[PDB]
Amino acid sequence: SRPASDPQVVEAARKEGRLIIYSATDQSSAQALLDDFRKLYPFIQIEYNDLGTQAIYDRFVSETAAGASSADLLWSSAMELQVKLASEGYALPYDSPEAKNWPANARLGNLAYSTTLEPAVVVYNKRFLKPEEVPTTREGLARLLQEPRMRGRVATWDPERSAVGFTILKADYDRFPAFQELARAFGKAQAALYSSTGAAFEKVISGEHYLAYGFFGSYALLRQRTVKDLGIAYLTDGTVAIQRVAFINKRAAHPNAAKLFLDYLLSLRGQNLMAYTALIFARRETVVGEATPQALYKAVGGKDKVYAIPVSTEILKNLDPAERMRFLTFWRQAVR
Template identity: 55%
Template sequence: MLKNARHALSLLTVSLLAAPAVQAQAVPNGYPASYASVIDGAKKEGKLIIYSSTDQASAQPLIDDFRKAYPFANIEYNDIGTSQLYSRFLAEAAAGTPTADVLWSSAMDLQVKLAADGYALSYASPESKNFAAENSYQNMAFGTTLEPAALIYNKRLVKPGDLPATHAAFAALLSGGKLTGKIATWDPEKSGVGFTLTEYDNQTNRDFGAVSLGLGKAQAGLYSSTGAMLEKVTSGEALYGYNIIGSYALLRQKTVPDLGMKFWKDGTIAFQRVAVINKASKAPNTAKLFLDYLLSRRGQLVMANQSLIYSLRGDVAGKATRATLTQAVGGAGNLKVIAVDKRLLDNLVPANRNTFLNLWRKNVKGQ
C-alpha cells in the first residue's frame, strides 16, 4: 500500500510540475508570455458571436481549425451581406440588445467607419508586426485578406479570343451590341463591397467611364452578392461577371470547371476583408483570439489552401496567396490594393457618395 501511495504521489507531483508547461504551450510561438491571460480569460467567456460577409463555405475551414486551436471556444457564425451587417449591428448596439463580438466584412469603408465612430476595440495584436501600415487603421480595423476583383466568364460560351485583356478592350466589347443582357456586375447602391469596388474602380481606372457606359448599353444585370453573379455566369444566363470577388470564384472552380477567371493587364483592384472587435464585446478575449488567428500564419495557411481566400501575409505558401495573385496579375505594379485607412471614409461623405452614384445611374441606368 505504501509503495502504491508513493507511486500515486509521484505521478501527482509530475502532473503538477507539468501544468505550467502545458499552459505555456497554448501560447502561440512568438507571442508574449502574458498572452496566457487572454487565453485564460477566453475560457471563462461565453459564446463568441461573429457577423461576417464571408460565405459560410469559405469560412468553415477557418472556424473548424480555430476550434482545434482553442477547443473551449463556442462560436456563433452569422453569414450576412455587407450593408445588412453594418445596419444590423448599429441597430442592435443602439438598442442594447445582444450583437456581434467580431465583425468581419469586405465593406472596407463601413468597417473603418465603425472604428472611427467609436465602436471598435483598440487592440495591439501580437501579429501586427507581420503587416504593413496599409493593412490596419489605428489598431482597430484589421485587413486580413488580399482579394482581387476579377472578370469571370463561362468557358463553354466564351471563346479564348473574346477575352479582353484591358478595361478599354472590355469597354469596346460591351459597346459592340452582342452582349445585351449577358453581363452581371455589382449594384453599388445595395452592396457595401459593391460600392467600395466600383467607386475605387472609378478612382483608379482611366477607362471606367467607357466601361460604365458599356455596362449600360449592354443592359447589365446588377446584383448585391457574388453568389448570385456566379450562378448567372455558370448557368450561361450571363457570359461575363465584372469586378467579381476572385476568392469566391476560385472556390467555385473546384466544382464548376466551366467557370473561368481573368485579371486585367492594366491593373487589378484588390480589397482587404476587414475585421473589427466590438468595443462592448461580451467575449473580448475570445474575440482577440479569433482576430489573432485570422492574422496568424496558421490561419492564413488555411485561407490559402482550404478556404481559397487570398491570404494577405507574404510568408504563406499555397494556391491563393499574395505571391500567386501577384504573379497572376502580371506583377506587383498591376495590383491596386485598397488600403485600410481614413481615406475610405471619403466614400461615405454624402456629397461624395451621391456624386459617384449619380454618375453610375447616368451611365449604367440611363437616369
C-alpha cells in the first residue's frame, strides 16, 4: 500500500528530487528498501552513504559546523549518538503520520524514531560447532569458552572502537549479571574484538573463529541465504535489541524527501519489506517474514526475555564519564 505522508509533503519532495542518507545499515540489507521506495516515488534519486556509526556522527557534526552540504536523513544503530544529535538541535521536528501508534519509548517526541527491533544474537559456523553444541545462555557460553578448542575461536564487539558495539555490550552489562562471567570467558578464550559485523562474520565464515557474540540478527539472516554453514542461536536468558534511530537533518537541503523516506520506513509496507525481503528485524508487530518481533519472541521464549533499548534521552546516561569508565574498566580487565 502507500505511506500516509501528507500530499503537500509528496509534492515538496518531488520539487527536491533527491535524498542523501548517512546510514550504518549495510547496503546489502538496506538495498531492497531503497529499490521499493524508488518504485513508490521514482522522481527521488537516493544517495546512500554506508558508513560506520562513529564516522556518521563525526562527519555530520563536522559538516554542520562548517555550514556545508550534509545528509537529509541519518539512520544508525548507535542509539546514544543518534539520541544525542536529535536532542541537541540537529533534528527537524516532524510528526510522522505512520508513527501514530509508536510507543513513547520508541520515539523522541517528533525529533527521532525507532525503525527496527534488532536482536544481538550468536552466529556460529556449523562445520565447526553443531547446533546441539551452542548454548543459548551467557553462563552456557562461558562454559563452552573454557574448552581448549575455543581458544582464539571467539569474535565479539570492540566497544571502544564501535559506537553500536558499545550500545549493545553496555545494555548487556547493565541488564544481565551473567554477562560478567561471559566477558571473563572472552578473556579465557582470547576473543578477538571487531568494529563491524562484516569483519566478525568473514572470520566465522572462513572458520578462523567458530562463534561471534552480539552481532545483528538482521545481517545473520541475510548472510545465511548465501552461506548455508552459518548458524544463529538466540539468547533464552535474555536478548538485547537495538532500535535503529532515523531522524531528519534540521538543515537538510531535501527535508520533504527525508519525511517521505522516514514515513516509508515506519509504514506497514516498509516494515513488511524489512521483515520479508531485507531480513531487517522490523519494529511493528503486524509484519510477516523471517525478521519479525513474533519470530524473535518465539526463539528466546517470550517478549518478556527481550530488553528493547528505549529511544530516550535517558540512554545518554551511557555517555556519562563515570558510567562509561565503570563499564570499559570492567570490560578491559575481563577480556585481556
